[PDB]
UniProtKB/TrEMBL annotation:
Keywords: Signal
Pfam families: DctP (PF03480)
Keyword Signal: yes
Protein known as: Exported protein
Organism classification: Bacteria, Pseudomonadati, Pseudomonadota, Betaproteobacteria, Burkholderiales
SUPFAM superfamilies from the UniProt entry: Periplasmic binding protein-like II (SSF53850)
GO biological process: transmembrane transport
Keyword check for Signal: yes
Amino acid sequence: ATSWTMTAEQPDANYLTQNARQFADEVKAATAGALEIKVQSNSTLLKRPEVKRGVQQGVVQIGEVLVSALGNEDPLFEIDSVPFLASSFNESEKLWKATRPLLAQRLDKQGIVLVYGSPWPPQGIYTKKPVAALADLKGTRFRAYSASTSHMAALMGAVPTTVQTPEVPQAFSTGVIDAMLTSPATGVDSQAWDYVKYYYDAQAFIPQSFVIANKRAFQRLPAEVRQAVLDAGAKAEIRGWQTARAKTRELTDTLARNGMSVEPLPPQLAKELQAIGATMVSDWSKKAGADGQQLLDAYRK
Ligand SMILES: O=C1CC[C@@H](C(=O)O)N1
């Protein structure tokens, strides 16, 4: 028998965390107890920027993390964060299908196995005051959570301030941040109605989360156990996509029930974020190589 420890980024409230828990449970049942994965969630073991290295170094054998957390190191890992490139689930899914094998190859070269992915819901904007154009956010201390969102915020004219998910309520309370961009899932997870008032259904992008394993640890399992992990992962990826699609509206309704103003994306903001998206995909294409171009070709196929 083998025991693994897994890190998961988000609290037990969060559906990606629940999907990882069910994945751990399904691995245990499918291997008849030969592999047990114990999940420590809410980034208490490793924080988002620490996950990849913790998995590589064997702090944990497996972990869940935002894909675009690897973006600074390798650009292919943040294509899911380019504004308005793939803002519907159907586009996101096609983008993911083109992105995944490239990521799996880039990770394998690093001693990491890509087990499965699942999407967050589309990213909206949360604010303390009404916003109708980028000007409203000029000089605003605006939460960033990745290299891509830091860059995006700067282009918006805001002052990017990196805050990891568990620290968001604190950061609002002490005035470190005054606005943010995130899904309605994080909005409900963190009960954001206590600290912000307006949510704009921007669908700026749909960032992926993935579950990645230490290759040496993975390779040491019996063949059948390795396959059970991959199959349980496949089921998790399907479950993850279905849940995100099924829950996006319920989560948005939850924000409104709890007194947030929930609004569609204002047209000037829509225009300006689209222009920001054009810049970023150009910026991205330059720093991605031919691998980048074959990804974009595959997507736009
Ligand atoms: O919807 C999302 C994307 C990343 C995560 C966060 O806010 O950090 N929640």
